[PDB]
Amino acid sequence: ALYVLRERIRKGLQIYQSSVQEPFLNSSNYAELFNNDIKLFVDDTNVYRVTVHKTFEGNVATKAINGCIFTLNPKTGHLFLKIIHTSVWAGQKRLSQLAKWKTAEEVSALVRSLPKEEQPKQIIVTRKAMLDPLEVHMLDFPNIAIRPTELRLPFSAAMSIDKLSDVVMKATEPQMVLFNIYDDWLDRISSYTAFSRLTLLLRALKTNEESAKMILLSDPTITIKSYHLWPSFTDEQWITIESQMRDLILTEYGRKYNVNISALTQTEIKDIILGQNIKAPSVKRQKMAE
Amino acid sequence: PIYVKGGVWTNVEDQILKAAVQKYGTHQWSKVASLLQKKTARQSELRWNEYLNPKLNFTEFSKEEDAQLLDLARELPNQWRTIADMMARPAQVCVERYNRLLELEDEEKEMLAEARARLLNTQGKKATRKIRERMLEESKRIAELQKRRELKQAGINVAIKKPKKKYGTDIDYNEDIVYEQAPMPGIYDTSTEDRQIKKKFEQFERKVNRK
Amino acid sequence: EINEPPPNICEQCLGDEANIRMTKIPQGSECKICTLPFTLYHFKTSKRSNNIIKTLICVRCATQRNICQCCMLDSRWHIPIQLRDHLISLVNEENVMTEEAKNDMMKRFLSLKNVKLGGAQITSDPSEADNIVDKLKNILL
Amino acid sequence: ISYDQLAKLSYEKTLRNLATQKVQKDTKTGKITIADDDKLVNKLAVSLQSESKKRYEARKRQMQNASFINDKNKQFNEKLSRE
Amino acid sequence: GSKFISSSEDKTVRIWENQINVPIKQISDTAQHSMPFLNVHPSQNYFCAQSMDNRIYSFSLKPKYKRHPKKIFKGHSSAGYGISLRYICSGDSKSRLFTWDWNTSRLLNNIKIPITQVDWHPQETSKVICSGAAGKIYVC
Amino acid sequence: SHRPQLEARSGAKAAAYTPTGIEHARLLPGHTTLKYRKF
Amino acid sequence: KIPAAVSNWKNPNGYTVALERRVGKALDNENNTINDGFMKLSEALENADKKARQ
Amino acid sequence: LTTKERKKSRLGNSFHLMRELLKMMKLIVDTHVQFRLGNVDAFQLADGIHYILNHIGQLTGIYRYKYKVMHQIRACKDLKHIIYYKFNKNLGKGPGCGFWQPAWRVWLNFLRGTIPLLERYIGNLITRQFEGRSNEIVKTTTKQRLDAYYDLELRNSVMDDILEMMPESIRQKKARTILQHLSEAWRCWKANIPWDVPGMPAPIKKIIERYIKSKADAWVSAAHYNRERIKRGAHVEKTMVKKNLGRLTRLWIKNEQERQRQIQKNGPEITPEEATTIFSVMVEWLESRSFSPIPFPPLTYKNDTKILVLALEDLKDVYASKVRLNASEREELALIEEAYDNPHDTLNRIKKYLLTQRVFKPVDITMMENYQNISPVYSVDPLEKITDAYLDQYLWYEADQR
Amino acid sequence: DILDLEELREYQRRKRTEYEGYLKRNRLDMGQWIRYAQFEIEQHDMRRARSIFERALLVDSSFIPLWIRYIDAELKVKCINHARNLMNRAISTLPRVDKLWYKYLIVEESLNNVEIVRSLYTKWCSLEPGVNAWNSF
RNA sequence: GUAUGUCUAAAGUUAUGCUCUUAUUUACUAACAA
Numbered sequence A: 001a002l003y004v005l006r007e008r009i010r011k012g013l014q015i016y017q018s019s020v021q022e023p024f025l026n027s028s029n030y031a032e033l034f035n036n037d038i039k040l041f042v043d044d045t046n047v048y049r050v051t052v053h054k055t056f057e058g059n060v061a062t063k064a065i066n067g068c069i070f071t072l073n074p075k076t077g078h079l080f081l082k083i084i085h086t087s088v089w090a091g092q093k094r095l096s097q098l099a100k101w102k103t104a105e106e107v108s109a110l111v112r113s114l115p116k117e118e119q120p121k122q123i124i125v126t127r128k129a130m131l132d133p134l135e136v137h138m139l140d141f142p143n144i145a146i147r148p149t150e151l152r153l154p155f156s157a158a159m160s161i162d163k164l165s166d167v168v169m170k171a172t173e174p175q176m177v178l179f180n181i182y183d184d185w186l187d188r189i190s191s192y193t194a195f196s197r198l199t200l201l202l203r204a205l206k207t208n209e210e211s212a213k214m215i216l217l218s219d220p221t222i223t224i225k226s227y228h229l230w231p232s233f234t235d236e237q238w239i240t241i242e243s244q245m246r247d248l249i250l251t252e253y254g255r256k257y258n259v260n261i262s263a264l265t266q267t268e269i270k271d272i273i274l275g276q277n278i279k280a281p282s283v284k285r286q287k288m289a290e
Numbered sequence B: 001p002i003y004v005k006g007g008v009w010t011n012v013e014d015q016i017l018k019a020a021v022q023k024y025g026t027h028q029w030s031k032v033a034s035l036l037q038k039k040t041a042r043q044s045e046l047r048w049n050e051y052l053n054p055k056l057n058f059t060e061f062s063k064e065e066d067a068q069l070l071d072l073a074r075e076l077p078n079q080w081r082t083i084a085d086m087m088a089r090p091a092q093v094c095v096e097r098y099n100r101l102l103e104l105e106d107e108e109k110e111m112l113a114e115a116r117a118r119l120l121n122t123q124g125k126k127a128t129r130k131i132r133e134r135m136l137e138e139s140k141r142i143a144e145l146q147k148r149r150e151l152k153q154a155g156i157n158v159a160i161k162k163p164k165k166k167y168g169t170d171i172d173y174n175e176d177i178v179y180e181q182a183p184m185p186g187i188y189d190t191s192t193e194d195r196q197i198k199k200k201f202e203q204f205e206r207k208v209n210r211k
Numbered sequence C: 001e002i003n004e005p006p007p008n009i010c011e012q013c014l015g016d017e018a019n020i021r022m023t024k025i026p027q028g029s030e031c032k033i034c035t036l037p038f039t040l041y042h043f044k045t046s047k048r049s050n051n052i053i054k055t056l057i058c059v060r061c062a063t064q065r066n067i068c069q070c071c072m073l074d075s076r077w078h079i080p081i082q083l084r085d086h087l088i089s090l091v092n093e094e095n096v097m098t099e100e101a102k103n104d105m106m107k108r109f110l111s112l113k114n115v116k117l118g119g120a121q122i123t124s125d126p127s128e129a130d131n132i133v134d135k136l137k138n139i140l141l
Numbered sequence D: 001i002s003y004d005q006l007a008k009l010s011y012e013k014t015l016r017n018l019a020t021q022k023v024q025k026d027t028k029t030g031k032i033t034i035a036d037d038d039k040l041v042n043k044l045a046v047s048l049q050s051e052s053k054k055r056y057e058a059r060k061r062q063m064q065n066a067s068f069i070n071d072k073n074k075q076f077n078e079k080l081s082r083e
Numbered sequence E: 001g002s003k004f005i006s007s008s009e010d011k012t013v014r015i016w017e018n019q020i021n022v023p024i025k026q027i028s029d030t031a032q033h034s035m036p037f038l039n040v041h042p043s044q045n046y047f048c049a050q051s052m053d054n055r056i057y058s059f060s061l062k063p064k065y066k067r068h069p070k071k072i073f074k075g076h077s078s079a080g081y082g083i084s085l086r087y088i089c090s091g092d093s094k095s096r097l098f099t100w101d102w103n104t105s106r107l108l109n110n111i112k113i114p115i116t117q118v119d120w121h122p123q124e125t126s127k128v129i130c131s132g133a134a135g136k137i138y139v140c
Numbered sequence F: 001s002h003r004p005q006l007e008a009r010s011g012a013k014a015a016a017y018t019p020t021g022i023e024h025a026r027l028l029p030g031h032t033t034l035k036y037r038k039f
Numbered sequence G: 001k002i003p004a005a006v007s008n009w010k011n012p013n014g015y016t017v018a019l020e021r022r023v024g025k026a027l028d029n030e031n032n033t034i035n036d037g038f039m040k041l042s043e044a045l046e047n048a049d050k051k052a053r054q
Numbered sequence H: 001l002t003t004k005e006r007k008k009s010r011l012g013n014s015f016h017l018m019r020e021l022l023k024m025m026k027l028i029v030d031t032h033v034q035f036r037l038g039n040v041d042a043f044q045l046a047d048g049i050h051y052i053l054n055h056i057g058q059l060t061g062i063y064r065y066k067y068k069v070m071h072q073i074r075a076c077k078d079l080k081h082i083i084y085y086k087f088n089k090n091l092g093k094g095p096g097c098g099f100w101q102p103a104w105r106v107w108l109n110f111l112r113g114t115i116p117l118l119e120r121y122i123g124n125l126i127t128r129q130f131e132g133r134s135n136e137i138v139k140t141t142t143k144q145r146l147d148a149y150y151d152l153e154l155r156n157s158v159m160d161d162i163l164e165m166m167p168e169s170i171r172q173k174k175a176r177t178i179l180q181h182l183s184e185a186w187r188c189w190k191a192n193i194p195w196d197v198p199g200m201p202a203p204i205k206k207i208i209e210r211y212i213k214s215k216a217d218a219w220v221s222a223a224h225y226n227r228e229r230i231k232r233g234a235h236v237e238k239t240m241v242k243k244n245l246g247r248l249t250r251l252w253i254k255n256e257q258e259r260q261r262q263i264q265k266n267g268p269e270i271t272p273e274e275a276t277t278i279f280s281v282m283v284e285w286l287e288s289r290s291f292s293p294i295p296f297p298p299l300t301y302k303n304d305t306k307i308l309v310l311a312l313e314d315l316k317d318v319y320a321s322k323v324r325l326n327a328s329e330r331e332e333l334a335l336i337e338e339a340y341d342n343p344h345d346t347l348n349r350i351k352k353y354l355l356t357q358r359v360f361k362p363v364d365i366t367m368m369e370n371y372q373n374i375s376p377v378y379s380v381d382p383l384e385k386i387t388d389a390y391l392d393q394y395l396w397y398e399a400d401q402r
Numbered sequence I: 001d002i003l004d005l006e007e008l009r010e011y012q013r014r015k016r017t018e019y020e021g022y023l024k025r026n027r028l029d030m031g032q033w034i035r036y037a038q039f040e041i042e043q044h045d046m047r048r049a050r051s052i053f054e055r056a057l058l059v060d061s062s063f064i065p066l067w068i069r070y071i072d073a074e075l076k077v078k079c080i081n082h083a084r085n086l087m088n089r090a091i092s093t094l095p096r097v098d099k100l101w102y103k104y105l106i107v108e109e110s111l112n113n114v115e116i117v118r119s120l121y122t123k124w125c126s127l128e129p130g131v132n133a134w135n136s137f
Numbered sequence J: 001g002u003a004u005g006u007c008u009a010a011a012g013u014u015a016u017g018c019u020c021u022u023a024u025u026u027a028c029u030a031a032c033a034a
């Protein structure tokens, strides 16, 4: 708490020495994300979603929709997500900041609920801006380390998965409805493998939803299992699908970035995540090493 | 794309400027400039002053006028604004004459549409908002009536809610007479007339009820 | 303003004592008709009578209706104002009402006017009152 | 033409519109009951309505006759042009 | 079955998905609406609706975001109702029913006898029901 | 919209208005006594 | 009979109006008494210059 | 608090002052209670009371509401300073002095002073709570609304006069034309453009001319008064000073162009003989010097580019500091940039302009406000400005060289 | 549109509120007064119309057209004595305007109360009016 | 983000040339993201 205070004051005086003890999750340390160690992963991107509708005056009026708290565990694949009922916005105004607060609040509550063993050690956050209030609501318990990811992971597009979005719309109240973000994959292979596939999928979605869905529903014979979020494929067709997705990502890169052809290996890997930034000194480090 | 203003006066543009001038007058050059997506305020005003204003003239000079001009040149050396004034002409034209003597559409249509739209829209936001509220209010009223009428048809008589009175001494004018300033006391007798008018009134009410 | 008009209280109301001692609070209430300050007068009818009688309405209002200021009854006949207006409407005429405007601003305005209402014009001049009475009597038979 | 003349001249006119085709006082009440022909008052009422109606329709025609932007401006430029 | 529409007293119409509870589209403001009915439109693009101001509208319901009316059905002093099959037939407040060519917005004006709730016998090609006030149902 | 002054707030209404009975600052009694001339 | 006042400054209602009725004055003509002296001056200069030159 | 609620709850200087006095009282009474409630010794009480009186400022923001209480506070402070140093001659430092008398006296006299003030203030307050506030509000003139009131009075007067004049007994709507006419006239006067509307009757034109002269007189004199005031260095509104600057500028321009008119209307001030004499003198001078004149600059120069670079640099000096720039400024910058890009071409352009261009874009002006003497700031249109620069630089180089 | 009674009452109220409001700002816009009075006439409530006219009159007596309008309104409902009384009152107020007198005269003529028109004419002439009055007489 | 302004907050007043499909612009707006 006192460190937070000093850091807060320091921010107030714009003298913040950018010095961290633990390095960020860059594309190199991505491997050492998980290491027989209980973790949790957080995204606050789709907490405050809005219906843009016209008014009588003619100007835009933003209205809140139900959202989520993307709360994933890469080992078990247990995606918690407390579905944000619009009722919680109805209380207050200045909702972009309040989104962060409710997020961190909810996360904190969740952590409190779980036991000292299952209290996750290193909590990773997508939005580095949403770290700031989390630090505050994580002051309940000091052992839970925070990890500001250098590598941006696509979890805005995570909520544009069919069944997820469905469930979000369905939500009538302050409720959470957890899922296993990958089930069959765990059964077949280790968690990391599953996560790579997932990462690819979410990535593709982020580039383009229509393309993603098309890829998923290219074959209509395949069927998405009642529990599972994803369509259960055989591993070779699965492989093919993955490849296709990758091509989609690369295609997107080619379109926007205009330099997806002459990529180095590590660099290419970074590009897939879209996380390893050019200015990020971690990347320079890994590169330097090789 | 944002950029630095200038260029050349396309005839459509000129016409637009003229229209603006008619509208806003010769001293609000900012607004007129705004109306033209290409041309500046200063540019516009200059143009109006120099070329576009109808109380200038571009008719050729008579021999006497030529004499006056060249004499002025001889006497006032190249103070051409002064010279122009003396002539009663715009200066550039005068200079040119003196010299003589000595020897895309989509964009344009966009600004047009916008222009005409503006010029035919001559009210501050307060006005627009007010009329909007008026029509909305009217709509609301008719909807309310439809409910009330519907209920009447249905057999439930609902009296229309009063306007939620803004202040303690706010008036409903149907309650009782506004500020009955009575007629001047009767010299000629008025009794029969009072009766007849009363009957007419009551009859009218009856008619309305039946209507 | 100055206490120019005197209070308009009737007899029955006031009680049969040769000398009562009443008090006047000036600017002492809004009236019961026109929401308008006036000199509130009040008195116990007897010394040991528990019920005070306070002058409900203002003097202008009283004059206007041509009534008592405590009873709200006509000062002549000691009867309800509406009733007397009905009686007057019946004899000599067909229509005599005394419409009070039920809107808080307008009532004030009306009160301000120095003009008698329907029945009040009859009952003010005693001759006319008498005439009305005899006509009423005639109507009876 | 002053409102002096225009009154008398309009007076003269409505006299041509006429040219086409008892007092009892209760002095105690002051009520001067002039009992007069109820048919003639009705003939005034209808004629006076007709006169006002004729004028009302006269504007309507002149309004429907035709360098401006809105209804008012067109007329405002017409107020300038008449000079 | 999926998309779902509901106009209101504030002169606003709302395309929704079946159960999502999130407006796909709030409609424009300066109009008024009362009765929502989808034309049995061969493509099934069209969501029609009667107004307060004597004018039934039409809306391109596929996509739900589309809402530009093509041609408006004027001339039925409205306090009531309207239904389609080629033709749209709606009744008025004052007098009588109004058949209208759905293509051109003009046809016969049949007497009612008031009230107005029109409908079509859909198993047949040409038969209407009028709903008069106080036991006066007229059939065609 | 926002308009010039033509028919002033006539103190007829202010006369018929009820008194306030507030005590303003300057109506506090200043220079109670009057002067007079020789005559 | 006063003319309807129209400004070069400020339309409240935004009525467009004719350009002649907008902009006026039309009195730059003068030119005569102003010149009496200038002739003498410029002529003087010309002659002075001539004298210097020769 | 909702903004409305907040507005409602800003209790005034009466209620707050009352609270503060009660706070004061509540303190000392509470201290007495404490003393008597067995807590503190009588010496402790005395010290407590003294502390309270000497720190009324620090214990109750009385000063906040009624700041003249600073005098009282100051007096108390002074007393403390006096008392202590007669109380602590041989005795050392510390807090344990009591002796609350003179400070207490001060506070009593302050209360005496304020009892009237609070009777009035809180009187009015509770009256408002009970009786509504007076609806015969009528506002006085003040510095803030003086002008508006003036002008309304003026137009009322003018309108009256015109109605008196006008024999038809025209409607108020026909007075709107009149007053609007007047307004335009005023503006015209401000401009120094003669207000000669054709269709008027002469008498009206006369009357309006008169009334604007009156108004004009009021204006000019006011302006003059203000500028002396500003010189003095008096309390004056930032807005007011800007207004005065504006007025004085317009006044200056009017004066100036009137002088131009004067010059035109009755010839140049210079007698032609005088001019001739001057010419003779200057001619004699250069004759004595063997001063070869500066040529029209051809393509010959080795310096040309260098010269250009100076002017551009000078121009750039304006723009290096101020990052946010106007449209004109932007244009100028662009021109400069292009000139750097295309030096020879720029030079050529300049030369062409010099050979040909004898009618230029008009020069906007403003007044920078040195509060003694407002200084005119001429703003030439950027294209000509480059020409002016280059020409200037060339002239200086040639002049000094020659 | 305006079907039932109570609804009409509401309409009347709303309209009044508009009219009243507009009068409040510009106590003098006789065009607005007379328009309002026309509205009253239209509603077929005569008393209210009369009241409006009275108020209007009070606000500005000198506007003759208002007087004329009131007069003619009175005539409209064959409330002839009221018209007559009013016209007499108008005369009393503004005798030196002619159009009022002429209005009176035509009214009486149409009425065929010829004796009264003689009598009034005698009065008007007695006040040393314009030559026009004499000639018309 | 605001001033500010509307809205809701439950008890029944006694009468018989077009439709269509789309892709693109531009503008405005947007305490929504960058």
Ligand SMILES: O=P(O)(O)O[C@H]1[C@H](OP(=O)(O)O)[C@@H](OP(=O)(O)O)[C@H](OP(=O)(O)O)[C@@H](OP(=O)(O)O)[C@H]1OP(=O)(O)O
Pocket: H055, H077, H084, H093, H094, H095
């Ligand atoms: O001079 P002031 O600003 O009013 O402050 C005085 C002053 O303190 P400083 O000299 O530090 O300003 C006194 O100190 P001396 O001058 O007497 O040394 C001290 O008086 P004591 O020494 O008797 O304590 C007194 O303190 P206190 O109020 O406790 O008597 C204190 O006033 P503040 O405490 O209000 O500053």
Ligand SMILES: [Zn+2]
Pocket: C009, C010, C011, C012, C013, C014, C068, C069, C070, C071, C072
């Ligand atoms: Zn009594």
Ligand SMILES: [Zn+2]
Pocket: C031, C032, C033, C034, C035, C036, C057, C058, C059, C060, C061, C111
């Ligand atoms: Zn009263």
